[PDB]
Amino acid sequence: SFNSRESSLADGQPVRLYQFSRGAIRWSYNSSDRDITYQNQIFRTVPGGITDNGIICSGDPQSDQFVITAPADLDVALLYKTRSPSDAIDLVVYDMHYGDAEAAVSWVGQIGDVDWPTVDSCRITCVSEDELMDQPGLTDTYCRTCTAIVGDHRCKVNLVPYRVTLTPQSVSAWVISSGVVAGYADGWFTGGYVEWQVDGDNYDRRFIEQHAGADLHILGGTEGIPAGGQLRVYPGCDGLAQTCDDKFSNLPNFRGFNAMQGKSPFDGDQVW
């Protein structure tokens, strides 16, 4: 009846539904003045209303953004206030008419940017998957180092054995200290990242600038790190062939070119 209602000249009762999902956690909002139950999901009513500006599909990712307006107290947007969540918040938009149990999917995407122009409002800019095609695609260089992030699909190195679970001893503004890591050689954890559970099955990740003794340096500060929460810390690969094989014994998968050639052409001037 959704299509029939759209074609109807007197039963038009538009209502737009938004679904923000991050793994196992979902946030449901509706633009009407009362909650709507759809597919066993109830959508909350935001005091003040939630509205968008329209959907544009012109083939230009930079121009085809989707804008959401909502109060500054919106739960899903509140997360971005202090620090952007590590994972992207997928957004799905449905369209349905009051009194009908059928809805149609209109827009699908993820959060691109969030800002709070006024205390009584917040503007969210949503981007589609098409915008991820503007970055280069070379991803190849003939250099000495590995040119591969430890654990990627190219290194084929399993980090689960190297996982270390610990409770930090003391947390400071920029340094998190723990005695368990003090037993490892300096720089063992350099290049690794720290992941811990925020809510449900979602974890927030932070990279490590440097590891020295019992003190760990966290890039961008330690804000948001629970002082007593359980933390998982993985090591980091420098990328050198000696580092790759002595520590991880992954030399066969070494993607770097240590000593094949640095400059030698076959159309130079004098070989000697």
Binding site: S106, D130, T139, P252
Partner: protein, 343 residues
């Protein structure tokens, strides 16, 4: 490989030749370490996995110590796709009695989108039906292309070049959310296409864009590269009808370096000439919710008796709809004049 050409450059009486042994390591997933290379070079020698490498050992030149630059031809496309090829039955297109092993552009786009080494998008995000239909159509038309990556530019530029070469639109479907591909071909039935009218879902049509005919070119030059030798080649497409009317000669140059055969270049050049000299009519219509399900590249009919416009077939362009608030759904459309002749 046993390369035997010790006297290529006249031998001792000339400048030497090419004699030696060539070993090729393509870089398979399970590729092992070559004992000879590691033994000769020494040190920490990895397996050089994931990249094609070659090891040459033998005579290079004589008399003079100045070796000459080389040129190597290499085909590819199957060793890509990591480990799981997609629809391999139509991956390659054979041309010129099998001399040229061209690749289907649809496969190129699919690899770029889903390739783990390029973008690594989940294979579940692509509408299989549309891509398979496009690949089947392209294979039937025998429309293959060859390309090389050295520009190091954004995916958008290369994808736009491929689309312009093949004449297709790639958009993220609003309803299902997957990536869909539509070809601009006259492969539609008039009846099944939806019709829009003032009383059937059309609000107002403002732009007319009558266009002009005295302008536009009369001669078109298409430049292409032949993959057999890699030498620049060109073909000429003429518009006799427009040429006669034109007071003075006009010409434009278009480069289709992806085209490996002159006949294919002429096929696409005829399409371009027809598009650019047929005088397309562009309309900017305003529609109600009845045009909600349309997507880019979808053709549909429009009729408006007061304007004197009979039933016309147009293809969707820019889309701007407003479901909440103003309720304005405005579409930009162009007359349907896209077709790729097979001869």
């Amino acid at each position: 490989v046993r390369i035997n050409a010790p006297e290529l450059f006249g031998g001792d009486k000339g400048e030497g030749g090419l004699d030696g042994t060539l070993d090729v390591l393509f870089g398979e997933e399970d590729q092992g370490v070559l004992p000879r290379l590691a033994a000769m070079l020494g040190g920490l020698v990895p397996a050089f996995r994931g990249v094609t490498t070659c090891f040459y050992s033998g005579l290079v030149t004589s008399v003079n110590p100045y070796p000459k630059k080389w040129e190597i031809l290499r085909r590819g496309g199957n060793r890509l796709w990591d480990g799981n090829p997609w629809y391999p039955e139509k991956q390659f297109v054979w041309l010129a009695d099998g001399q040229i092993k061209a690749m289907n552009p649809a496969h190129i786009l699919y690899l770029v989108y889903t390739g783990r080494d390029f973008r690594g998008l989940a294979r579940t995000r692509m509408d299989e039906a549309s891509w398979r239909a496009a690949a089947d159509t392209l294979y039937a038309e025998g429309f293959g292309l060859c390309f090389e990556w050295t520009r190091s530019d954004s995916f958008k530029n290369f994808c736009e070049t491929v689309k312009s070469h093949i004449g297709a639109e790639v958009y993220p479907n609003r309803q299902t959310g997957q990536i869909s591909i539509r070809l601009l071909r006259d492969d539609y039935n008039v009846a099944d296409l939806p019709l829009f009218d003032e009383d059937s879902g059309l609000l107002e049509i403002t732009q007319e864009k009558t266009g002009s005919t005295s302008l536009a070119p009369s001669q078109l030059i298409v430049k292409y590269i032949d993959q057999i030798d890699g030498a620049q080649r060109q073909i000429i497409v003429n518009n006799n009808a427009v040429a006669a009317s034109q007071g003075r000669r006009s010409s434009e140059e278009i480069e289709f370096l992806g085209v490996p055969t002159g006949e294919l270049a002429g096929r696409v050049g005829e399409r371009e000439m027809r598009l650019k000299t047929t005088g397309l009519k562009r309309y900017k219509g305003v529609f109600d919710r009845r045009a909600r399900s349309l997507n880019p590249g979808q053709p549909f009919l429009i009729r408006s008796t007061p304007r004197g416009i009979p039933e016309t077939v147009v293809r969707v362009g820019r889309i701007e709809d407003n479901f909440l608030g103003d309720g304005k759904i405005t579409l930009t459309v162009v007359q349907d004049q896209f077709n790729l002749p097979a001869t």
